Symmetry: C2
Subunit: 354 residues, 2 copies
């Protein structure tokens, strides 16, 4: 049923969470601006830099293994990656290039290029359902039937099996995260920016799994959206941020916990839910990052690793904080002292401790 | 310029042609009903049985090597193959399944399945142009822009580069051969059922290479087609066969010669053109097959092998002819005597001798 988040909590985040840090290796062949998305594969970390659109492979220890494909307009090359996935059998890695309207398939074992196909429709993110069919999101708002739904399930070959979740508010402007589909074991879950509900989505099912409520705020109404968007024609995002409503919200789930980052009154918050105890804890990120002694926490990467939530930290930004006597975490400061000003992000691995 | 075919010729076909025969091996794993299309690849013969839709690999000696994929509705499986091609680099073999609206890619070396994509539009046959782009035929007659052309050139990914050859008469009913695109060296050629002209087709070119004229007959006029087809709605094929016009015509070209099978007044004819001497010879197939001492010659397979035209011969049909004292060719009769009544077709390899 409901996961109620109260505004404040007087419990320190340091006590209820267990931390870990990892330094990513910094070579000319593997420079990283942003850690947009992350996935485990054997004893490696698949990382997508959605700022520069490079797909990299790193090791558990932080060593660079290899790049998956490269940038360019040819076959097997890409311009702007929004997402990727590993098939259930671990044969291929399929990356989605939204700039060139294609899907590129690489080998899951050796990382070489296999083949490329065109995207069947306007979409940014996809995942393989346990039965083998593919769940894609629908980024359409035109005449098309697909424009009246949030997601769509297709077969291996991309022919549409069924359209999923009715989309009332239609617009060219999207507000939520780019990746709004994830896995927990074999089950695939999905969610939308104007419905505080996570649905477990199969080929012939839409069943809610979690619903949220936050004290003193909520998602925008349908009327508020249409008035501030001229029925979908204009960008409501500015007016949305001026209101008391929930501006943005992303969800990452593991076996033990569930983190909910969101925006309200122009400020970033994070709600932690401990599934074992059934307890919620809400923190403004300004408070959250100072309590864990990590300086800045601009965003959480989508994906998790051994049930740990990932958050890349900017080295230079933190080194200046350290230089100004910022009281850092023992293990973070140890890695920060051996890091050059130009080094890639130090990843924060964090979860609810049992 | 023109290749004029006179009705009759009083030169025997036995004198101007050189023959050869090959027996295909007959196992339960490689039963063949029809030899629809044939292509060379290393020292092997790729054969498509378009009657049963099985793609086979045979050896120069006639031994069965392996089947390319198999029949079925799954990934890598097919229902109804119309054509296939080998890429210029000899990496893959791409077969077109018109039943399931997909293209299946297999390995050119080991014959295992690589990947499958959907056909970009209604089409039956394709070939890679020397520059790398793909030439496809257009089997559309609806609203679509592609319905107003005979062929279309697309990139690697299937996006349309340019539409080729204006199609005046539009209909759901097609009269010519299924494969109307071929190679001679690196150049790709194409032709239509109502234009006695072979065009060399590139990405930015339509240049005629050969034009034909036959004594006492011609292709149907545009008016004859529209009257007998109710402006494309009805099947004109019956009325077409009742007329003196050319009912059907297929062309196979090599470096040394060019064979033209066609239909007229309900009877099959064959025009041989010797490029070296610049001489034509026309024969009704009833006369042609008796002159070469081969009994029945129902059809010529599309494709050639070391500049030899291929024609599969039915064993049982010929063995009964032999049983009735038919005066067969020495080498054909030698293979026919060691052939069982149930054995696959004996291929006739024939060309203009130098």
């Amino acid at each position: 049923t409901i996961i109620s988040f109260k505004e404040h909590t007087d419990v320190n985040a340091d006590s209820i969470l267990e931390l870990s840090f990892l330094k990513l290796q910094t070579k000319d062949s593997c420079l990283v601006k942003n850690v947009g998305l992350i996935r485990e594969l054997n004893n490696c970390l698949l990382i997508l830099d959605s700022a520069n659109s490079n797909l990299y492979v790193f090791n558990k220890s932080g060593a660079f293994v290899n790049q998956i494909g490269q940038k360019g307009s040819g076959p097997g090359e890409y311009i702007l990656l929004s997402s990727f996935f590993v098939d259930n059998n671990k044969n291929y890695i399929a990356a989605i290039d939204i700039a060139q309207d294609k899907v590129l398939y690489y080998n899951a074992t050796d990382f070489s290029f296999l083949y490329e196909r065109r995207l069947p429709f306007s979409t940014s993110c996809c995942l393989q359902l346990e039965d083998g069919n593919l769940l894609w999101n629908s980024r359409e708002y035109t005449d098309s039937k697909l424009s009246d739904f949030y997601f769509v399930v297709t077969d291996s070959l991309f022919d549409i099996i069924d359209y999923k979740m009715n989309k009332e508010f239609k617009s060219g402007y999207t507000t939520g995260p780019s990746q709004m589909i994830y896995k927990v074991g074999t089950n695939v879950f999905a969610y939308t920016p104007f419905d505080l509900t996570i649905y477990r989505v199969g080929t012939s099912e839409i069943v809610p799994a979690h619903s949220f409520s936050f004290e003193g705020t909520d998602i925008p109404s349908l009327d508020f959206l249409n008035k501030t968007s001229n029925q979908g024609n204009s960008n409501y995002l500015y007016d949305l941020i001026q209101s008391d409503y929930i501006s943005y919200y992303c969800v990452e789930e593991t076996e033990r916990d569930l983190f909910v980052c969101y925006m309200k009154n122009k400020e970033k918050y994070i709600g932690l839910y401990d599934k074992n105890t059934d307890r919620t804890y809400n923190y403004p990120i300004k408070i959250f990052q100072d309590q864990l002694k990590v300086g800045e926490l601009n965003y959480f990467s989508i994906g998790s690793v051994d049930d740990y939530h990932v958050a890349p930290l900017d080295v230079l930004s933190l080194k200046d904080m350290a230089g100004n006597g910022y009281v850092f975490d023992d293990k973070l400061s140890e890695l920060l002292t051996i890091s050059n000003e130009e080094d890639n992000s130090i990843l924060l691995f964090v979860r609810i401790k049992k």
